[PDB]
Design goal:
The structure is cut from a larger assembly and holds three copies of chain A.
Chain A (H helix, E strand, L loop, with lengths): L4 H11 L5 H18 L21 H12 L5 H14 L2 H11 L6 H4 L8 H17 L4 H12 L6 H15 L4 H16 L1 H17 L15 H15 L6 H12 L8 H19 L8 H13 L3 H7 L7 H5 L21 H21 L5 H13 L7 H11 L5 H11 L1
Helix pairs in contact in A: 1-2, 1-4, 4-5, 4-7, 7-9, 8-10, 9-10, 10-11, 10-12, 11-12, 11-13, 12-14, 13-14, 13-19, 14-15, 15-18, 18-20, 19-20
């Protein structure tokens, strides 16, 4: 019994909120023994007794004990949570709402265990997170409230972000591109990212830029036939969701967002093609509604015209989603929790490198308008370097697209560069 | 012209006449700027009164005859007339009884609003798919034109659409209300 | 319409958490019109647009706007809460959990109205309280 104090402490608090008047008192006495035996420090005082009339609405009392112990009794954390989750499933609907109430304060304490000198306790925290992910998938009704408490608050701990984000990708990977498990993890990242916009944005982008950079090792005729295609597809759905309301920090990552848009336009199933169109419409909108940057009244008029142009039937054809009345409807699916996506109509349109110029020159017009205000900007000089790396490197799926873009944006060319272009033609 | 067709009765023959007359009233309201009207407003109200009586749903099942499926088209055709007639029409009650003008309008607005709402519930697919989709689309477009002209006397009765049960119908009511605010 | 800014504000926020991708976007535009027309003060900035892909898990966004308006827009309180309760009953189970999240910040503003010189606003607050009392009796699971 001495070895498992945390496991008993959850039995006391779960049964204090029961509906049997003779079981609340039985739990009060057990709680009294634990504090004396283990010298746990709490706010008030407790005295064993028999015959107490404990009220049913015993909710703000439980939350005060759990909150106090969590503050000044951290070592119980790992073994407490493991038990609390296990009791979550077995309890009824009404008791489930209670487990959330007193579970949340403990989640702060995972800060220290996540980097506990790789003592195999780090392996434990990741196991707990995998358990939390499974509750979210199944408890559809309580979805609006799990996001605000568990993920909303757990995502405000800077040191803990890296491990939490990593588990999201692995769970989605097993499901697949259209699987429910991968669809849900895309939504949850929105709540996680609200705490630290500047850190989740520069960490989901940083993974995409590397997966694309690793297709060079095993060149393939097309991306969809590459082994790493599934990794690229799911990571794109994350970028779609994070783009709304400026949760992808555009004022710092605009070069790395256009760079990826040009390598994805008009590739994939019809669902993935309406996502790329939506992503562009949200990056432009974020510019017009950002406070960090101070665009003069002239520039803001340039953007608003671009915002309308991209929604014309002309650009629906360029992106390759013609015959679709609205992109929003196709991009999202209502029954995304119940069933997995069901792709069909494998017949897939072709792409023409002349279309890529028209898009690649519309974006370049937007970027230059911004640089006029932003002093000593580096956006265009960063984008060129990214293109210049794929342009002169053998990759039969990305090289053609990286040449049409290298020329459309570059502002200076030397004799040494021209020979490479003319020797790729030979 | 309507009164004679109004009293014609119900039959496979007489139904087709009603349909064609309804299509005339739609074409007559695309040339309203060219024509000449002695009293434009007082005339548009009566036509709405005489045409609302013909939009009767679920009357082909009680009749128990598929030969009278035309009544489905008559309701589809009738609504298009009511949409065109209603576009920009302030309400004005006939002065047959002595009551306050402001009160008479609010009463009048609810008279038509409930009529459309009842026809809207029936068109739900849960309660031919193209027919219901088209008729349902018209039944809301007709309602939007009714509200825009009469915001003062009909906004209160209309707020209940915000929590309507059809998701596609809630978006339209919100788009309408967005315009109303923006206008000065 | 100029006399009911609070009655509309609840329609925009309730439907932003909907499950129809073409009903979130329509509701976002309505919210934009309200702030400009009525000079409501919010944290960020909003820009009317068409074609936006608004994510489904749009929960901490609503709670942030609602919390801001309640802090620095109190006069809307009474007519806002009356509508929110009325919208509680008609909504489904999942949307019921949303209404709780962004309803709470407003409750703290009833202080001023409870003793508003017995201007018949005091009779109003008691009407709201009796409405809350009825939710508690019926919603056993929550």
């Amino acid at each position: 019994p001495k070895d498992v104090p945390g496991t008993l402490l959850n039995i006391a608090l779960l049964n204090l909120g029961s509906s049997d008047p003779s079981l609340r008192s039985a739990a009060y006495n057990l709680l009294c023994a634990l504090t004396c035996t283990f010298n746990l420090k709490i706010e008030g005082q407790l005295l064993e007794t028999s015959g107490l009339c404990i009220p049913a609405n015993n909710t703000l009392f439980i939350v005060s004990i759990s909150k106090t112990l969590a503050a000044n009794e951290p070592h119980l954390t790992l073994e407490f949570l493991e038990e609390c989750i296990s009791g979550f499933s077995k309890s009824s609907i009404e008791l489930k709402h209670l487990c959330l109430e007193y579970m949340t304060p403990w989640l702060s304490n995972l800060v220290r265990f996540c980097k506990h000198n790789d003592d195999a306790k780090r392996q434990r925290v990741t196991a707990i997170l995998d358990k939390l992910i499974t509750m979210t998938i199944n408890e559809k009704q309580m979805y609006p409230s799990i996001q605000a408490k568990i993920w909303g608050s757990l995502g405000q701990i800077t040191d803990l972000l890296d491990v939490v984000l990593d588990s999201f990708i692995k769970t989605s990977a097993t499901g697949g591109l259209g699987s429910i498990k991968a669809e849900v993890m895309a939504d949850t990242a929105v709540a996680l990212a609200s705490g630290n916009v500047k850190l989740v944005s520069s960490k989901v982008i940083g993974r995409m830029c590397k997966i694309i950079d690793k297709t060079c090792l095993s060149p393939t005729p097309t991306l969809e036939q590459h082994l790493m295609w599934d990794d690229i597809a799911i990571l794109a759905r994350y970028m779609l969701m994070l783009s709304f309301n400026n949760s992808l920090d555009v004022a710092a990552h605009l070069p790395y967002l256009f760079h990826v848009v040009t390598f994805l336009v008009a590739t994939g199933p019809l669902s993935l093609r309406a996502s790329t169109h939506g992503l562009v419409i949200n990056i432009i909108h974020s510019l017009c509604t950002c406070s960090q940057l101070h665009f003069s009244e002239e520039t803001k008029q340039v953007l608003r015209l671009s915002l309308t142009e991209f929604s014309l039937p002309k650009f629906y054809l360029l992106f390759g989603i013609s015959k679709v009345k609205s992109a929003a409807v196709i991009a999202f699916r209502s029954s995304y929790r119940d069933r997995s996506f069901s792709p069909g109509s494998y017949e897939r349109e072709t792409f023409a490198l002349t279309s890529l110029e028209t898009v690649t020159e519309a974006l370049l017009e937007i970027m230059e308008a911004c640089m006029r205000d932003i002093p000593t900007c580096k956006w265009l000089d960063q984008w060129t370097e990214l293109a210049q790396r794929f342009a002169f490197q053998y990759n039969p799926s990305l090289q053609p697209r990286a040449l049409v873009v290298f020329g459309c944006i570059s502002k200076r060319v030397s004799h040494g560069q021209i020979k490479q272009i003319i020797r790729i033609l030979s | 012209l309507v009164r004679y067709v109004r009293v014609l009765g119900n039959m496979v023959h007489a139904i087709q006449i009603k349909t064609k007359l309804c299509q005339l009233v739609e074409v007559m309201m695309a040339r309203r700027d060219d024509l000449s009207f002695c009293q434009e407003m007082k005339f548009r109200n009566k036509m709405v009164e005489y045409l609302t009586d013909w939009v009767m749903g679920t009357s082909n099942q009680a009749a128990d005859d598929d030969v009278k499926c035309l009544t489905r088209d008559l309701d589809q055709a009738s609504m298009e007339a009511v949409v065109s007639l209603l576009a920009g029409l302030p309400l004005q009650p006939e002065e047959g009884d002595g009551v306050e003008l402001m009160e008479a309008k609010s009463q009048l607005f609810l008279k038509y609003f409930t009529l459309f709402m009842n026809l809207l519930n029936d068109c739900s697919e849960v309660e031919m798919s193209r027919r219901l989709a088209s008729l349902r689309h018209c039944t809301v477009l007709a309602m939007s034109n009714l509200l825009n002209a009469n915001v003062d006397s009909g906004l209160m009765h209309s707020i209940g659409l915000g929590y309507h049960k059809d998701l596609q119908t809630r978006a339209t009511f919100m788009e309408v209300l967005t315009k109303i605010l923006q206008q000065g």
